[PDB]
Amino acid sequence: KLPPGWEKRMFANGTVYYFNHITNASQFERPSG
Ligand SMILES: *[C@@H]1OC[C@@H](O)[C@H](O)[C@H]1O
């Protein structure tokens, strides 16, 4: 499902986003790569 290095992440207010654990990058939209 999810591409390499990405993992799902979430704010203290309950808002979900995406985080790259290899690069420390982050984004709201679901990652294609
Ligand atoms: C929840 O935390 C992330 C921020 O971007 C949103 O505006 C807030 O509601």
How would DSSP label each residue in 4-24?
A: TTEEEEE-TTS-EEEEETTT-
| Ligand 1 pocket, residue 28 CB under 6 Å | no
Q: Radius of gyration of the chain from Cα atoms?
A: 9
The closest residue, in CA terms, to atom 1 on ligand 1 is 13
CA 12 to ligand 1: nearest atom: 2
Burial of 3 (0-12, 13-18, 19+ CB in 10 A): exposed
Domains of the chain are 1-33 (2.20.70.10)
Residue 11 CA: nearest ligand 1 atom is 2
Contact by Cβ (8 Å): 19, 11: no
Work out the angle at residue 13's Cα, subtended by the Cα atoms of residues 17 and 3, and round it to the nearest 5 degrees.
Answer: 15
Give the list of residues 6+ apart from residue 32 with CB closer than 8 angstroms, or none.
Answer: 3
